Design a protein around this ligand. Structure first.
Ligand SMILES: [Mg+2]
Ligand SMILES: [Zn+2]
Ligand SMILES: [Zn+2]
Ligand SMILES: [Zn+2]
Lengths: 50, 343, 65, 197, 148, 53, 348, 199, 103, 49
């Protein structure tokens, strides 16, 4: 739990979630299903353009 | 020969020792050379028939000949989910001191069927929790349990010590709204079984609540399902490849259902024959006897479906089947109107 | 805790046949013949009634009252 | 009051822990000749690798018991044998191996192989998806090190451990690693003197 | 005529390795006119066969006897005079392999054509003169008719 | 010695490498992460010397 | 201006499992929102994550930079990491309930009419496959009855439409291959695909699984790019469950019960092994026992007893495999290699 | 007794896996911490962070292990040749003999785009071409096939059929695969090696 | 907004049509599939479900010649409606005669 | 050891920091003699489906 191993090499971040998984064959291999509740919490900063 | 095998594949479903064969519906144009399986309304109306074999309260059994597995499964699923009925949805509680949880109590009340006719009501619009006279019903349930003023000294049984300690569904009092009292005569709007045990109380506890019921289909929730068990099965037709007599006849009669195989003494010797293949359930116990495997041929008729519909008591099952057919017709008409609006 | 009103698999009304079943337990009827006389042909309702434990009175014994 | 949904962990009294993958309606469930639709459909592929014949024996004994109104015993190194429950099944008119003729609910056509139906004692576990579901916004940070907290009850975020850093290095995503470990976690602007350092 | 091959064969064995499949069997057949051996997968459920059965088999490039090779799409609903009317068991496949005989080290004159009728294997082995017209990646029709 | 080395059960089996009768099988169950078991088959009837999983 | 928008469809999102062994334990996928409360993905990607859907929790990260998002989508793309850098073997491939389904589909006994074949083909026509032609293949048998084999239906997955330039070609051996048929095996275990058409053989773990090379998905990845392989895997994952549910696959107590001849053989083998072990015990205790080289007499007896027990085990297993009939669910799942093996069957 | 022995074996396996997990975790940590500095440069030389060269060329040749189609080999010439023959079947072109195949191979290989390729891969291509030409020669000697193209049974030309178009396609495909299977500069080869050894 | 049509590609080809139907399930899909499958002018008919969460189905129809694949749709709908009317009348008559003969 | 079910007859008056209860607990159909010894059938922790 030192500074190098606990705060420099590996550290906790925000904009992340942790949830149990369940199978769903109707989705592609490069696609993943996200719940609506977590989707409303994790936000992405988009810059306003033309 | 080849024609016999083709007919057996296109008309019968054979059940083997390890797996079932000829289960797919194949009577379609282009699949068979010597058969013109094109759609013909006249031949369908000629071959199709319905014969009811048993009809009592909350129970129906009828054989349909000429219909296919697709339409049969469609009718079954419409009966199971797409038949709208009345069920408890909203529960307003006023000082529930019962041990049973409020949510569990509401869930139990929602499962209680209502004898109200669903065709006389309509679906509640989005929102509108207050409810209107057309699309809601109110049931008042107020039970106050208390000690019996006159009882024995011991009174070990709770029936003598307390009164109204078991809140049955018979205590439900229908509260008419607007002009529902004039339209619905007294005694029509009531619980179906009238003996369902909702909860058990103790002296001091009280259950006071109002139940708002609206129209809904079984697809949304299972509490709207009018039928308890609505299913269909293929009509069995057991055939004997070779005449079986002797004690082997008794073995055949004991391996199958007691009511399908009957033994008779035509010349003083016991010979077995198929009496009523309807009573057979295809337990496949004849495969245990080594010698009696190659003497019988278990099969199911493809175009003969026995439907058994046991309802919960909201309405007779014939009206349930009629309403299912009407809902399917309404879906077809809605899709036709949509297609006409598109073009 | 209490006998459910609907069956899990099919949905036949079974809450109303509980106390009567208890009466069949007070009588000389066994489990199988009682479940047969109650009208439970399929084994799902038989499992629902037989495997059910009556815990409502055990909780009412601890109720405030 | 919680209802089983996708993510709830269930056990079957044989170490066959599982998670609810899909909740299909009643009409989509297959039906037998009697009209019984199953409540739980489990994967058969878990049987060969684990060799859980005890589950099949328990299923057969439970089916025989609910048929004849009895309670069979699963006592270790004993209990009710297979022959007794097979005789109980053949006596009531059902198959002596549990497999019954089942018609598919979706297509309405019978299945080519018989389905193994029977009552199984399933137990629900305390592991719920509602309690384990977590999402972390910017949120608070720790006083000592300005990083998100650890636990979910403390509104904490996930930890990109050393192995995650190793994977990101192996992928070669330098900008993603920089955004994760510097920008989005403990970014700050300090003032450094170019004379003394 | 698009008849690439035509010969009368007699079955010598039904299942040399046992009853592997319920619906399909691996029939071994020998011709009378030539020494053409045939190892063919056949469907006994719709077309039953026996050990002593003798049948005429024709491998053709097209199903129409008039010579029209227009086989872009097959419509089973269309009714027209075709070669299949003169036979009883018609399959559609593609000649996916042409392999020379490896048993004869020198002066070999025997070849074999491997055709996959939707997975059903057919090895027709014999003199290369009889296999004239067989080419790889060529779709053909098999027509089998049992004789008395 | 070959006679002493062939102190194993595997005789007259079929391997997916050279389908020779004489073989040498070994079964391992020492991994809980791998739900199935582990096989090791060797076939040196014609001096092949295969060693796979 | 900056707008903190919600997670919508199309956003690149990292998905990872806490115990990380290799780099494939964390991959960047495309997020699709669903009303449920769990992280759902294609099961064909369970092998890199080493997940088993038994309550394991996984982490989901959202990058906050366009450069990081692009690097995650390109370098850590699922279609671009279909093979591990250890030995090049493809990890994202078919899994249980997909190997068995494809095996039962490509069996020689399969013969489907027009309706069932059309249904199985349309079962995959969702998403990007809604803008392509069906290309219904011609039937194999047509004069007696018009039946479409399962191999053609499986090959439709490879080449769905006419304009699809995918031409899959493969020639390999299966698990139950005899070794002499050379595409004429009695068990039909020689896989041969020409022009995205299954000519012979049945699919199994050796061809559809993530075991090693010669995988059809690996050939598609190496020949026609990543997108075609991904589309083929999606079509397989959408087709195999539908057919597996419409056909029915179950295991019962009757699928693991021994036969009379099997019991007799087991009894004889146990008697013979016990007699030989008693003879070895009597030889070592009273007298001189042949000592194997490189070990003592006690270790020699231990090795001999282990050899006798292994002989009993393997002979009982061979007898059980010979007495078992086809269409047996454990034997079927053992042949295709989806789950289990012959050793587990012999033990159970 | 048998159940107790089976439980003993199960617990032994469980504790073995429990110790193995920790041991391999520590080993993987050490290996990654030691190997995280290496990287593939643009001059095909693997160098450390301080600039010291570890290898003048990765693996001696410079091929991507993730793009290794064969068993530690870049391409399987047999499978590639079969795929080229299957995808592009030319029915309007005659077959090639041994001498013609060798001549067209030598004429195509001497182009400019094949000069930058490694010599070992070119030697392997020449060896495979010589082998397939010897096979075609043996087949034509066994079946008396004449190289002039006037043999009456044309089906004999279907045993080993090869056309210069297929030869060019095969050579171009092999060259493209060998060029695209090389080590891309900038990849963290050390971390990939550490992970592929620790897993 | 319930049933919507889709062409096979941007070329607007009437031979291959896809009907997306809302708030439906396997019942009506399979019924219409069986009722339109017997049409001799239909080469391919197939219904599928996009996802079990959303209540919608996709049917795909490919005809033989130059049929717009919209006329077979209406034909199958009308045939299914006629079959439903016929079975309803037959069931009503059966129930009526059963009640008459029972008393 | 982590199964959900009833705790005892006084589970309603009991106030713990975390408690999981089953709505309709049912005793197993295949019960061991140890179950009858420990009286688990009086307090089941599962349902038969
Ligand atoms: Mg796990
Ligand atoms: Zn029930
Ligand atoms: Zn300074
Ligand atoms: Zn070998």
């Amino acid at each position: 739990q030192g500074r190098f191993r606990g705060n420099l090499s590996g550290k906790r971040v925000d904009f992340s979630g942790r949830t149990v998984i369940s199978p769903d064959p109707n989705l592609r291999i490069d696609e993943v299903a996200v719940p609506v509740h977590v989707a409303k919490i994790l936000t992405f900063p988009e810059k306003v353009n033309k | 020969a080849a024609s016999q095998a083709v007919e057996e594949m296109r008309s019968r479903v054979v059940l083997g020792e390890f797996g079932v064969r000829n289960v797919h519906t194949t009577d379609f144009p282009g699949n068979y050379s010597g058969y013109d399986d094109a759609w013909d309304q006249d031949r369908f109306e000629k071959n199709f028939r319905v014969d009811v074999v048993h009809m009592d309260e909350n129970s129906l059994e009828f054989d349909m000949v000429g219909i296919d597995a697709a339409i049969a499964n469609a009718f079954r699923r419409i009966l199971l989910a797409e038949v709208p009925t009345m069920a408890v949805e909203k529960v307003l509680v006023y000082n529930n001191t019962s041990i049973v949880q409020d949510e569990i109590l509401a869930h139990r009340l929602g499962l209680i069927p209502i004898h109200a006719d669903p065709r006389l009501f309509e679906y509640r619009n989005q929102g509108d929790e207050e409810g209107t006279e057309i699309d809601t019903l109110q049931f008042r349930l107020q039970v106050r349990c208390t000690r019996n003023p006159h009882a024995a000294k011991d009174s070990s049984d709770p029936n003598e010590l307390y009164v109204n300690h078991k809140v049955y569904t018979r205590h439900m009092t229908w509260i008419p709204l607007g002009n529902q009292a004039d339209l619905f005569p007294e005694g029509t709007i009531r619980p179906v079984h009238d003996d369902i045990l909702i909860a058990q109380l103790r002296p001091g506890q009280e259950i006071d609540l109002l139940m708002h019921c609206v129209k809904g289909i079984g697809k949304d929730h299972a509490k709207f399902s009018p039928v308890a068990t609505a299913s269909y099965r293929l009509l069995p037709d057991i055939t004997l490849l070779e005449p079986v007599e002797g004690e082997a006849a008794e073995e055949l009669s004991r391996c199958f259902s007691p009511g399908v195989i009957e033994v008779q003494e035509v010349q003083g010797k016991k010979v077995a024959r198929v009496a009523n293949p309807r009573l057979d359930t295809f337990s496949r116990e004849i495969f245990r006897n080594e010698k009696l495997k190659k003497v019988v041929r278990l099969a199911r008729v493809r175009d003969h479906y026995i439907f058994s519909v046991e309802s919960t008591g909201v309405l007779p099952p014939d009206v349930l089947v009629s309403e299912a057919i009407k809902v399917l017709m309404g879906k077809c008409r809605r899709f036709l109107d949509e297609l006409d609006a598109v073009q | 805790m209490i006998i459910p009103v609907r069956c899990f698999t099919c949905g036949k009304i079974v809450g109303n046949k509980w106390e009567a079943y208890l009466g069949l337990l007070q009588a000389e009827y066994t489990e199988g013949d009682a479940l047969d006389a109650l009208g439970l042909k399929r084994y799902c309702c038989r499992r629902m009634l037989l495997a059910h434990v009556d815990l409502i009175e055990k909780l009412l014994n601890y109720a405030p009252l | 009051t919680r209802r089983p949904e996708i993510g709830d962990k269930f056990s079957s009294r044989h170490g066959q822990k599982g998670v609810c993958g899909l909740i299909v309606p009643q009409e989509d469930m297959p039906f037998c000749d009697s009209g019984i639709c199953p409540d739980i459909i489990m994967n058969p592929h878990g049987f060969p690798s684990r060799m859980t014949v005890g589950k099949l024996i328990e299923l057969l004994a439970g089916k025989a018991g609910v048929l004849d109104g009895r309670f069979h015993y699963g006592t270790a190194f004993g209990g009710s044998k297979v022959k007794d429950v097979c005789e109980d099944l053949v006596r009531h008119g059902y198959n002596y191996l549990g497999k019954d003729y089942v018609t598919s609910g979706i297509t309405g056509e019978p299945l080519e192989a018989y389905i193994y139906f029977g009552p199984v004692y399933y137990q629900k576990l305390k592991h719920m998806v509602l309690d384990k579901m977590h999402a972390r916004a910017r949120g608070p940070r720790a006083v000592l090190t300005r990083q998100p907290t650890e636990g979910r009850s403390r509104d904490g975020g996930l930890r990109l451990g050393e192995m995650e850093r190793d994977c990101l290095i192996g992928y070669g995503a330098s900008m993603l690693l920089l955004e994760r470990l510097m920008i989005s976690s403990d970014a700050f602007e300090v003032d450094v003197c170019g004379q003394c350092g | 005529a698009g008849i690439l091959f035509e010969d009368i064969f007699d079955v010598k064995d039904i299942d040399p390795e046992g009853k592997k499949f319920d619906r399909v069997s691996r029939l071994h057949c020998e011709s009378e006119s030539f020494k053409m051996d045939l190892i063919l997968d056949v469907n006994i459920q719709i077309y039953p066969v026996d050990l002593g059965d003798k049948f005429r088999l024709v491998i053709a490039s097209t199903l129409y006897e008039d010579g029209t090779l227009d086989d872009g799409e097959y419509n089973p609903t269309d009714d027209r005079p075709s070669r299949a009317d003169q036979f009883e068991y018609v399959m559609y496949g593609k000649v996916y392999r042409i392999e020379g005989d490896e048993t004869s080290t020198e002066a070999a004159t025997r070849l074999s054509a491997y055709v996959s009728y939707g997975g059903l294997l057919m090895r027709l082995q014999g003199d290369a003169n009889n296999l004239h017209g067989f080419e790889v990646d060529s779709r053909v029709y098999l027509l089998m008719k049992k004789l008395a | 010695g070959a006679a002493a080395w062939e102190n194993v059960d595997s005789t007259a089996e079929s391997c997916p490498k050279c389908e020779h009768p004489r073989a040498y099988f070994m079964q391992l169950q020492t991994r809980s992460a791998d739900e199935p078991m582990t096989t090791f088959y060797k076939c040196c009837n014609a001096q092949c010397g295969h060693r796979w999983r | 201006d900056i707008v903190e928008r919600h997670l919508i469809d199309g956003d690149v999102v990292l998905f990872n499992r806490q115990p990380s062994l290799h780099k494939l334990s964390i991959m960047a996928h495309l997020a699709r929102v669903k009303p449920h409360r769990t992280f759902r993905f294609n099961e064909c990607v369970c092998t890199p994550y080493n997940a088993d859907f038994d309550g394991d929790e996984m982490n989901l990260h959202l990058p906050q930079t366009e450069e990081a998002k692009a690097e995650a989508l390109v370098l850590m793309g699922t279609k671009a990491n279909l093979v591990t850098p250890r030995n090049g073997e493809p990890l994202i491939a078919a899994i249980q309930d997909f190997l068995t389904g494809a095996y039962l589909l490509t069996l020689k006994d399969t013969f489907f009419d027009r309706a069932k074949a059309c249904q199985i083909i349309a079962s995959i026509l969702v998403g990007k496959d809604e803008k392509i032609k069906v290309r219904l293949p011609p039937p194999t048998i047509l004069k007696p009855v018009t039946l479409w084999t399962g191999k053609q239906i499986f090959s439709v997955i490879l080449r769905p439409s006419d304009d699809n330039p995918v031409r899959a070609n493969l020639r390999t051996k299966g698990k139950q291959y005899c070794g002499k048929g050379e595409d004429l095996c009695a068990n039909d275990s020689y896989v041969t695909i020409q022009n995205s058409e299954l000519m012979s053989g049945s699919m199994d773990k050796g061809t559809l699984g993530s075991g090693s090379k010669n995988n059809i998905f690996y050939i598609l990845l190496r020949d026609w790019g990543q997108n075609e392989a991904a589309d083929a895997m999606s079509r397989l994952a959408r087709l195999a469950p539908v057919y597996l549910s419409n056909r029915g696959f179950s295991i019962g107590i009757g699928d693991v019960t021994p036969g009379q001849g099997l019991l007799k053989a087991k009894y004889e083998l146990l008697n013979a092994g016990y007699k030989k072990c008693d003879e070895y015990i009597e030889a070592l205790n009273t007298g001189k026992l042949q000592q194997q080289p490189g070990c003592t007499a006690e270790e020699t007896l231990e090795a001999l007893i282990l050899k006798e027990l292994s002989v009993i085990r393997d002979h009982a297993g061979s007898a059980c495999l010979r007495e078992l009939d086809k269409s047996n669910s454990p034997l079927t799942m053992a042949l295709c290699g989806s789950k289990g093996s012959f050793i587990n069957i012999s033990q159970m | 007794t048998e159940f107790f022995f089976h439980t003993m074996a199960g617990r032994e396996g469980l504790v073995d896996t429990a110790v193995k997990t920790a041991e391999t975790g520590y080993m993987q940590r050490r290996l990654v911490k030691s190997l995280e500095d290496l990287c593939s440069q643009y001059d095909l030389t693997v160098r450390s962070s301080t600039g010291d060269i570890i290898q003048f060329i990765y693996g001696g040749d410079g091929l991507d292990p993730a793009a290794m189609e064969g068993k530690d080999e870049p391409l399987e010439f047999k499978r590639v040749l079969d795929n080229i023959k299957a995808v592009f079947p030319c029915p309007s072109e005659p077959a090639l003999s041994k001498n013609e195949l060798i001549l067209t191979t030598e004429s195509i290989m001497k182009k400019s785009e094949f000069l930058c390729c490694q010599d070992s891969f070119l030697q392997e291509i020449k060896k495979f071409i010589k082998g397939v030409s010897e096979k075609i020669k043996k087949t034509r000697d066994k079946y008396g096939i004449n190289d002039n193209g006037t043999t009456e049974p044309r089906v004999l030309y279907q045993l080993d059929r090869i056309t210069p178009t297929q030869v060019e396609k095969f050579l171009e495909t092999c060259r493209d695969k060998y060029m695209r299977a090389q080590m891309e500069p900038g990849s963290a080869v050390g971390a990939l090696c550490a992970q592929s050894i620790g897993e | 907004k319930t049933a919507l049509e889709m062409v096979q590609a941007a070329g607007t080809d009437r031979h291959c049509v896809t009907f997306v139907l809302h708030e439906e399930d396997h019942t009506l899909g399979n019924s219409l599939r069986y009722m339109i499958m017997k049409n001799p002018e239909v080469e391919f008919c197939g219904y599928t479900t996009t996802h079990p969460s959303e209540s919608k189905i996709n049917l795909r129809i490919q005809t033989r010649g130059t049929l717009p694949a919209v006329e077979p749709f209406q034909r199958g709908l009308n045939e299914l409606m006629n079959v439903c009317q016929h079975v309803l009348d037959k069931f009503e008559a059966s129930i009526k005669d059963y009640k008459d003969q029972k008393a | 050891k982590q199964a959900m079910g009833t705790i005892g007859y006084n589970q309603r008056n009991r106030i713990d920091t975390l408690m999981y209860l089953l709505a309709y607990p049912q005793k197993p159909m295949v019960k061991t003699k140890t179950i009858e010894l420990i009286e688990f059938e009086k307090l089941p922790a599962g349902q038969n489906a």
